[PDB]
Amino acid sequence: NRFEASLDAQDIARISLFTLESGVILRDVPVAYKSWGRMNVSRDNCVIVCHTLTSSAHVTSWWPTLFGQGRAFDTSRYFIICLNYLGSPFGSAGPCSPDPDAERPYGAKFPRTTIRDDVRIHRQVLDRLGVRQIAAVVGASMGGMHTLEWAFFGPEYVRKIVPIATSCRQSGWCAAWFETQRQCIYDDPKYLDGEYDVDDQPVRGLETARKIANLTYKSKPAMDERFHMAPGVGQPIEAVSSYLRYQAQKFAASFDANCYIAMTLKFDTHDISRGRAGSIPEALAMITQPALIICARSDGLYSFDEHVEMGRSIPNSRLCVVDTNEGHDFFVMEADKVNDAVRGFLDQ
Amino acid sequence: NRFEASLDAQDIARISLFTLESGVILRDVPVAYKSWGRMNVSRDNCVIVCHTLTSSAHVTSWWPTLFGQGRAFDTSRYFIICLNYLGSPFGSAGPCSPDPDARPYGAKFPRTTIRDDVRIHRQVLDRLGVRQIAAVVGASMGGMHTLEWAFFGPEYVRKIVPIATSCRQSGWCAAWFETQRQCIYDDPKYLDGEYDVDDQPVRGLETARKIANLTYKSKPAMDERFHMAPGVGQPIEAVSSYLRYQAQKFAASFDANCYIAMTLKFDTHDISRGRAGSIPEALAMITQPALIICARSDGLYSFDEHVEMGRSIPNSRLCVVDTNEGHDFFVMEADKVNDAVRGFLDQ
């Protein structure tokens, strides 16, 4: 697995049998994770960070300024842990990991997993590490979906949550965007129904998917600052072409197509209320922990309004609106502001 | 030209020589157009409608309810005319039309700008004997031409209705349209624009159009159309084929090289270049009454930029359509746009 191989050192837990909520049984299941800091004697200073769609468990690589003495993820006070999602190419069971029923990797036959499946298996790993209580879950985008799900363990196990730039349930809007992206991959003749060779990926599908995704993560103001026309009578508009190509090419060179499909399909299963309550507001009201909901007005995927709805129905919640024009991106572009918010909340 | 061939009847004007603002000279240039109604004796009841990126001059086919007695484009009062842009597959000079130096222009059709279209169109209007224009009305790309028509001055162009549009190309829109063109550039069937006309880069074109179509939507509109069953088409399952369906139809009935040519036009747009030092200063040179129509959740052309138009155009009124639709709105909410345009044309 070349994708996992490119990472810094990390731990693997192996779960010998795991029942997906579909009823499919996974065997000999690796769950990759990375932790920083030390558990206290009481084993109750654990902070779980939930990562983003295409990231690895190594949160330090895109959230580096959230880490360290006095920062949000204060390695002097907390045991910070991030566990890799099923479906990912970075160590946990997914299309890229060995299939024990044919050993060859799962490839295109890796079962469907849900947000709730990840939360369940990740908590099994924590039980093994001996974690007795969780000081906080913090996660953005896809990770704020897991964060909301962790909360349902109750306030005795999960003390606080910080869902960032996220939703309670899949929306038509995002479903359409991610389906569009998946279709770019399905239509690449190199895809071969997911049977492609690992070093002959559907590169053009993946790029195109990534370009789309990357723009949905931006805002109009942000792209307008970055590229504009000369006054009347890179930065110029000419430079857009290669901006788009550059980072999309890098991603396609270093991510797996089948994992992109598997991970995004996870989004479609998300609903904090299914099986639990008759509506989203009623499910939100079952979240009893203090919550800090962090959002930006010009996130184009996860709306301001839906974050306001979270804050309205979660009984002990505070809404934090980041002062920015950056779009869904903001939680990375404005890392210092997110850090201050998270740290202030963790100190109460 | 199979694209032009699928249309209802229309007129063609032939301009024997036309100098593009690049300096490239086009020769024996067809300009296709379609009109409704009759000019009055004075020849001053002309309403120009500016069409959208992928549309023909046949505005009735996507704006049918704007036409008719008592409606905005009232064929009892006005001579309504829409001329086809250069670069389009539907009749005006473009990749699909005969090259006078050869066979169609194909991939070798010159860059044209918004200003080129306005100039050759106005030459056509001069031939038709139009002495004054009662109003120019247009949305998305058409709003760009609309703003450009205004620069002829209030003696020739009496009023403008720019709808869902911008004063200048933005990084945001350039990124979206360049992404779309890159879908076409990467389709192995594109062949640097040298493809055979009946073996189009269909997959590039579809993909470019799916992306485009979603950028025309809003979150609330997509959320109403597709959602999840309550806790414990309409379903999310149905998104897949919604995306394929209309995109497939488009790719079957539009030309790749034209898509490229047309979208590249967007990059040249700037009402201020050569005229003024900023956008606000150019907008202040617009002396006609203007009705600026927009929606709050247009994701391509922002509420704020229409507010800026209204702020700098001295005799302007901003009309914010009550809708949750996105860029689409001017079509989804045709009746509201009709009422606004008509009320303005009645002043």
CATH of the domain at B63: 3.40.50.1820
Are residues A177 and B236, on separate chains, in Cβ contact within 8 Å?
no
Q: Are B145 and B56 in contact (CB under 8 A)?
A: no
Instruction: Please state, in angstroms and rounded to a whole number, the distance separating the CA atoms of residues A109 and B87.
Output: 46
Q: Which of B163, B171, B174, B167 is nearest to B295 (CA)?
A: B163
| Domain membership of residue B15 as a residue range | 1-347
B281: exposed, middle or buried (Cβ count in 10 Å: 0-12, 13-18, 19+):
middle
- Tell me the shortest Cα–Cα distance from A22 to chain B, in angstroms: 17
Catalytic positions of B, written as ranges: 140, 327
Contact: B178, A244; criterion CB under 8 Å: yes
Residue A306 forms contact with B (CB below 8 Å): no
CB-nearest partner of B236 from A175, A208, A273: A175
Residues belonging to chain B:
347
Using an 8 Å Cβ cutoff, are B197 and B308 in contact? no
Q: Find residues 215-274 of chain B whose CB sits inside 8 Å of chain A.
A: 217-219, 222-228, 230-232, 236, 239-240, 242-244, 267, 270, 272-274
Cβ pair A223:B182 closer than 8 A:
no
CA–CA separation, A316 and A289 (whole Å): 7
- Do residue B228 and residue A170 have CB atoms under 8 angstroms apart? yes
CA B35 – CA B75 distance, rounded (Å): 10
Q: Which residues of B touch A325 (CB under 8 A)?
A: none
Q: What is the resolution of this structure in A?
A: 2.5
Which residues fall within 8 angstroms of residue B346, CB to CB, at 6 or more apart?
none
**Alpha-carbon dihedral B193, B197, B202, B204, rounded to 10 degrees:** 10
Chain A, 37 to 96: residues with Cβ < 8 Å from chain B are none
Judge residue B347's burial from the number of C-beta atoms within 10 Å of its C-beta, 0-12 exposed, 13-18 middle, 19 or more buried.
exposed
**Which of A217, A240, A306 is the mutation pick for testing B, counting most B CBs within 10 A?**
A240
End-to-end alpha carbon distance in chain B: 43
Chain A positions touching B230 (Cβ under 8 A) are 278-279
Give the residue before each break in chain A, using a C-to-N cut-off of over 2.5 angstroms; say none if it is continuous. Answer: 103, 233
Interface with B, mutate which of A208, A286, A304 (most B CBs under 10 A): A208
Instruction: Test A179 with B222 for CB contact under 8 angstroms.
Output: no
Residues B250/B206, Cβ–Cβ less than 8 Å: yes
Q: Which of A178, A190, A203, A233 to mutate: most B Cβ within 10 Å?
A: A233
Structure-solving method = X-ray
Ramachandran angles phi, psi of B299, nearest 5°: -95, -5
Strands B290-294 and B316-320: parallel
State the CB neighbour count (10 A cutoff) for residue B6. Answer: 11
CB A142 within 8 A of CB A52: yes
Exposure class string for A100-131: b at 16+ Cβ within 10 A, else e: eeeeebbbbebbbbbbbbbbbbbbebbeeeeb
Integer Cα distance of B119 and B125 in angstroms? 10
**Polymer length in residues for chain A:** 348
Which residue of A215, A274, A303 is in closest CB contact with B176? A215
B210 contacts A175? CB cut-off 8 A: no
Residues of A taking part in catalysis: 141, 328
Q: How many other CB atoms are there within 10 angstroms of residue A162's CB atom? A: 27
B-chain CB neighbours of A300 within 8 Å are 219, 299
Residues in chain A within 8 Å Cβ distance of B169: 229, 237
| Number of domains chain A is built from | 1
| Closest to B99 measured CA to CA, from B29, B31, B32 | B29
Nearest-Cα residue of chain B relative to residue A273: B231
For the beta sheet containing B316-320, the strands, ordered from the edge strand earlier in sequence to the opposite edge, are B11-19, B25-36, B79-83, B46-50, B133-139, B160-163, B290-294, B316-320
Contact A171 B223 (CB under 8 A): yes
d(CA B263, CA A141): 32
The letter for the amino acid at A23 is G
Least Cα separation, residue A236 to chain B (angstroms)? 9
> Which of B182, B268, B297 is the best residue to mutate to test the A interface, defined by the most A CB atoms within 10 Å of its own CB?
B182
Q: Which residue of chain A comes nearest to B203, CA vs CA?
A: A187
